[PDB]
Amino acid sequence: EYENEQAGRYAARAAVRLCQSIVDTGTYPATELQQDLEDLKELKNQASLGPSTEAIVKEAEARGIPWTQLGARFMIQFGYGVNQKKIQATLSNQTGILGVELACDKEGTKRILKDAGVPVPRGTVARYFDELQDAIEYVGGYPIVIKPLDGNHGRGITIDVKNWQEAEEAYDLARKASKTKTVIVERYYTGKDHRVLVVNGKVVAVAERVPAHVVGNGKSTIAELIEETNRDPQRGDGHDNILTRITVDKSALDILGKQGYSIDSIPLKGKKCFLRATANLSTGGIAVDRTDEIHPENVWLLSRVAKIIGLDIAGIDVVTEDISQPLREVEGVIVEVNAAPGFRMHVAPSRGLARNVAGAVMDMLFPGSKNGRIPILSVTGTNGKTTTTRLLAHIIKQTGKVVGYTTTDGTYIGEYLAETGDNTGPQSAHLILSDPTVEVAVLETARGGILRSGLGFSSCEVGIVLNVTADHLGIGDIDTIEQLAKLKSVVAESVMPKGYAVLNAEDPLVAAMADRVKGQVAYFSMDPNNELLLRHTEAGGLAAIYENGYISILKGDWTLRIEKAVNVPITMAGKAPFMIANALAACLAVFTQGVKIEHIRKGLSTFVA
Amino acid sequence: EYENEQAGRYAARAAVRLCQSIVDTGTYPATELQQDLEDLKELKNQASLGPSTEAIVKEAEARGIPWTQLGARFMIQFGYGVNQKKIQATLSNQTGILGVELACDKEGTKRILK
Amino acid sequence: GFRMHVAPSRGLARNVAGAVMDMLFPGSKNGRIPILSVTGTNGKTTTTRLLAHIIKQTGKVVGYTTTDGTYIGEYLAETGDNTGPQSAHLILSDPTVEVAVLETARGGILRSGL
Amino acid sequence: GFSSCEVGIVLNVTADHLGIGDIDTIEQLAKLKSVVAESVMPKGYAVLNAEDPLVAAMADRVKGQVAYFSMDPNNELLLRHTEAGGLAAIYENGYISILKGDWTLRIEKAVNVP
């Protein structure tokens, strides 16, 4: 058993080498063992997804929704056929280009939000020095924030200035950093900052950010809290854990020096003393859950903002004195909107209740108690797989559905050929199930695919087993007909509880698969006097027989005749008895899915080989 | 009547100046007239959309569907309230981020199509 | 771009804009919502508020603008607003408004029109 | 009066009044009250009180899912049921909370309920 393909193969290759080295020398060097272990760890880390992706994948697996990994851009596809959805990290196939592009433009989104009445921080553009004073009149005085018009990742932007000389030097620095000599000055808003997550137009979680700080509640200074904090298991490196190690950098040391306290200075009255002012969880900030104590008007406003920008999943930054009051009484503003936010901060608040963000996302993708599954019919057997598969496809084509079917001849999507030189393994199944237009999948499953790579799907709605004959043996580890029966039993065993297993009652080996099969069992037989079939029909039903020149279906105590068995072109007026079994199997499989009798008749009369 | 707001205001401001210059001197210099005409042409060209946008806007107007110009990124909004749609040049609000990003990656789209 | 298809220079032109507009609005439908414009000398505000309250009884989101302020359904959107085209644009651009009720004063008609 | 019910709620069983009919023992009363819990369809739910041992003993011989409600948030049976499964309700810190497995959903402050 393995969890990662490359890691599993490497471990398998290394085990035999280790055993050979032991039997050759009596012991294995420790350095080689450590090399192998670190190589395994590197392999495991390499084939790993971003934490949001594992969260969503685990949530999907908890609901029984199939998921596959596309090879293009680390995209994950949920579902099959026309019911599939795609996610990358948090962006879905429904997320718009226009909304994402607008969110990346700060001035554009600010102007859009201002036109809709949403409170936004006041600001003004200026290009000449003498105009700055006038701008100070518009913003309302001090303090102010200086930023350049064209800049990414905060190039040359100050945080807080409260007098004339610092404002002048910050403006000069920004102008020397600005590419167009023009600078926006905006009113600095003080207050607690919150990060609100909006999914499908509804607020899911609200988190309050507190800047990285220390508290002297234990009557101790930083010299001991540095080791005290290291004992918490949450601390670590990377970008997967919310609690990162406290990096005492030169900038942070200068900030705490100008903060107004010293290394040995005890906090006054027992107040938190901050180490940085960025208020970031990656830096080492603290999240607080405030989902419950939010005013309904604020929720309505945030939902309106998310709908106005045009983002299904959005992260809004708010600055307010209190989140339990409307943003009008307090001087609250909307700072920025992010199109692809991470929710690692909301899953582990570290103070409060955790919120199920992955559940909300999965509910948005699949609204009701529905999964992205499509009808699947897997046909296996020794002799007549191809004809049965083609007959099933032709019969289902009579209904207005697009049918994708794979067989020995080639892979077909509806009416037009998709692949000529294809195999009947998992590759063709993946090709069929990934098409955005296929509604019903019909797959011929040969034993070679099962032995080499196994089945390409977790479960099937209909599993047909025609017959098992030991006409060819000696391949692989299959040397006995019992082994072949066990190999063919995989299709029957991998049937969901609401599915059907269509088995041949005449063959004792195939009929022995009645047990260890979840879901209903339907028998088809060329002999209408089979004891097992009659016993099954008397208590239950759903069998198919060939009684008096007729293809009949027994639904218990009732008999439904389909065709005269001589009007079917493939039977050649009944001269070929082998094709009648395939016709019986196909008709029974189609009937188990609810297709009307007249459709089956029309499909059977028209189909040609 | 005007077709462009800035062009119309400029023409209105220029007409009275031209008439005052005529009644003051008896004629208007040709260089100033050419300057005003080229300024009007520049104003008309400045407040113009990409040809796809005029095509779609004309088609929408032929069907009596209201259209407005948003001030963010040259986006055009059709309709009112819950029945509105947005287009930039040919991208709609229904166009996905994933599809656009995949189309820009040649190797990724080739591997997907294969 | 579809400028190449509109003017093939050899063959028949194709209506790409028509196809795009059909994709945006499938049937013979437009992006219009119910609009009620109230004008008068004396009782515009009371009539507008009464209309909004009556329509609110039906399960619809109503956006209405009057002298007091611009309201989107139940929650106040703008306190210090005018009854001109600006409030109308604010009402009609909201992605949740289904019925618009607007008080139209003569000042807005004289200054900027409807 | 019905063959099956979608939701069957059993609050508590106390032997405050006995001697009627053939019900003279609290076990007989528990068996009589167990009819509602037992007559629940496989897709239904049985809402039982985890604090009462007699009511909690009805966990077996019941078709369909079982949901426990308790006034004590430290009940061992409720926590064990939530760890493997979920759908319980508790009163933890002045809150009416619902446990859906590893998640807690708070409803009311328990003092705003009249």
3-state secondary structure chain D: CCCCEEEEECCCCCCCCCCCCCCCCHHHHHHHHHHHHHCEEEEEEEEEECCCHHHHHHHCCCCCEEEEECCCCCCHHHHHHHHCCCCEEEECCCCEEEECCCCEEECCCCCCCC
Backbone phi, psi, residue D105, to 5°: -120, 115
Q: Is A177 exposed, middle or buried (0-12, 13-18, 19+ CB in 10 A)?
A: middle
**Residue ranges of E strands in A369-494:** 376-380, 403-406, 411-413, 416-419, 440-444, 460-465
Structural domain including A522 reads: 376-606
Backbone phi, psi, residue A445, to 5°: -110, 105
CB contact under 8 Å between D103 and A292, yes or no, is no
CB contact under 8 Å between B78 and C20, yes or no, is no
Backbone phi, psi, residue A195, to 5°: -115, 115
Q: Which residue of C has its CA nearest to B78?
A: C31
Q: Which residue of C has its CA nearest to B62?
A: C18
- Chain C neighbors of B95, CB-CB under 8 A: none
Q: Is A506 exposed, middle or buried (0-12, 13-18, 19+ CB in 10 A)?
A: middle
Backbone phi, psi, residue A358, to 5°: -60, -40
DSSP-derived pairing of the beta strands A520-524 and A495-504: parallel
Q: Which residue of B has its CA nearest to A100?
A: B97
Against chain B, the chains showing at least 3 CB pairs within 8 Å are A, C
- Chain A neighbors of B91, CB-CB under 8 A: 97-98
Intra-chain end-to-end CA distance of chain A, in Å? 44
Q: Is A317 marked within a binding site?
A: yes
Chain C: residues touching B (Cβ < 8 Å) = 1-3, 6, 15-18, 20-21, 23-25, 29-33, 35, 63, 89, 92-98, 100
- Chain C neighbors of B58, CB-CB under 8 A: 17
Q: Which residue of B has its CA nearest to C60?
A: B82
CB contact under 8 Å between A116 and C90, yes or no, is yes
Q: Which residue of A has its CA nearest to C79?
A: A117
Which of C24, C70, C76, C87 to substitute to test the interface with A, most A CBs within 10 Å? Answer: C76
d(CA A123, CA A185): 6
- Chain C neighbors of B65, CB-CB under 8 A: 21, 25, 30-32
Please tell me the distance in Å from D107's CA to the nearest CA on chain A.
9
d(CA D82, CA D78): 6
Resolution in A: 2.9
Residue among B51, B60, B87 minimizing CB distance to C3: B51
d(CA B72, CA A314): 19
- Chain A neighbors of C24, CB-CB under 8 A: none
CB contact under 8 Å between B97 and A98, yes or no, is no
Q: Which residue of A has its CA nearest to B72?
A: A108
For A132-169, the three-class secondary structure string (H helix, E strand, C coil) is: HHHHHHHHCCCCEEEEECCCCCCCCCCCCECCHHHHHH
Q: Which residue of A has its CA nearest to C96?
A: A304
CB contact under 8 Å between B96 and A94, yes or no, is yes
> Which of A17, A65, A62, A8 has its CA nearest to residue A40?
A8
d(CA A440, CA A414): 10
For A97, the 3-state DSSP assignment is helix
Residue among D102, D103, D106 minimizing CB distance to A292: D106
Please tell me the distance in Å from A422's CA to the nearest CA on chain D.
44
- Chain A neighbors of B100, CB-CB under 8 A: 97
Contact assessment for residue A222 and residue A262, using Cβ atoms and an 8 Å cutoff: no
Contact assessment for residue C94 and residue A301, using Cβ atoms and an 8 Å cutoff: no
d(CA D110, CA D101): 22
- Chain C neighbors of A297, CB-CB under 8 A: 75
With touching defined as 3+ CB pairs under 8 A, do chains D and C touch?
no
Cβ-based neighbour number of residue B70 at 10 Å: 17
CB contact under 8 Å between D106 and A353, yes or no, is yes
For A282, the 3-state DSSP assignment is coil
Q: Is C97 exposed, middle or buried (0-12, 13-18, 19+ CB in 10 A)?
A: buried
Distances (CA, A) of A32 to A27, A35, A37, A39, B76: 11, 5, 9, 10, 65
Cβ-based neighbour number of residue D42 at 10 Å: 8
For C1-56, the three-class secondary structure string (H helix, E strand, C coil) is: CCHHHHCCCCCCCCCHHHHHHHHHCCCCCCCCCCEEEECCCCCHHHHHHHHHHHHH
- Chain C neighbors of B71, CB-CB under 8 A: none
Which of C24, C61, C89, C96 to substitute to test the interface with A, most A CBs within 10 Å? Answer: C96
- Chain A neighbors of D104, CB-CB under 8 A: 353-354
Residue among A115, A304, A328 minimizing CB distance to C96: A304
SS3 content of chain A, % helix, strand, coil (to 5): 35, 20, 45
CB contact under 8 Å between A93 and B98, yes or no, is yes
Residue among A116, A300, A301 minimizing CB distance to C93: A116
What residues of C form the annotated binding site for Mg(2+)? 45, 67, 103
CB contact under 8 Å between C70 and A117, yes or no, is yes
CB contact under 8 Å between C89 and A300, yes or no, is no
d(CA A321, CA D92): 29
- Chain A neighbors of D102, CB-CB under 8 A: 354
d(CA C70, CA A115): 13
CB contact under 8 Å between B91 and A108, yes or no, is no
User: What one-character-per-residue DSSP string does A501-555 give?
Assistant: EEEESSSHHHHGGGSS--SEEEEE-S-TT-HHHHHHHHSS--EEEE-SSSEEEE-
CA angle A29, A33, A35 (to 5 degrees): 115
Q: How many CA atoms lie within 13 A of D101 on its CB side?
A: 7
CB contact under 8 Å between C16 and B92, yes or no, is no
Name A102's Cβ contacts closer than 8 Å, sequence gap at least 6: A108, A109, A112, A309, A310, B72, B73
CB contact under 8 Å between D106 and A354, yes or no, is no
d(CA A222, CA A512): 74
Which of C14, C20, C24, C96 to substitute to test the interface with B, most B CBs within 10 Å? Answer: C24
d(CA C98, CA A436): 34
Sign of CA dihedral B6, B7, B11, B17: positive
DSSP-derived pairing of the beta strands B76-78 and C70-72: unpaired
d(CA B91, CA B103): 13
Please tell me the distance in Å from A540's CA to the nearest CA on chain B.
47
Distance of CA A607 to the CA centre of its chain: 41
Q: Is A336 marked within a binding site?
A: yes
Distance of CA A29 to the CA centre of its chain: 43
> Which of A385, A351, A365 has its CA nearest to residue A60?
A365
Against chain A, the chains showing at least 3 CB pairs within 8 Å are B, C, D
- Chain A neighbors of C90, CB-CB under 8 A: 115-117
d(CA A3, CA A435): 28
Q: Is A444 marked within a binding site?
A: yes
For A308, the 3-state DSSP assignment is helix
Contact assessment for residue A456 and residue A432, using Cβ atoms and an 8 Å cutoff: no
Please tell me the distance in Å from C87's CA to the nearest CA on chain B.
14
Which of D103, D107, D108 to substitute to test the interface with A, most A CBs within 10 Å? Answer: D103
- Chain C neighbors of A117, CB-CB under 8 A: 70, 77-78, 90
Q: Which residue of B has its CA nearest to C33?
A: B80
CATH code at position A543: 3.40.1190.10
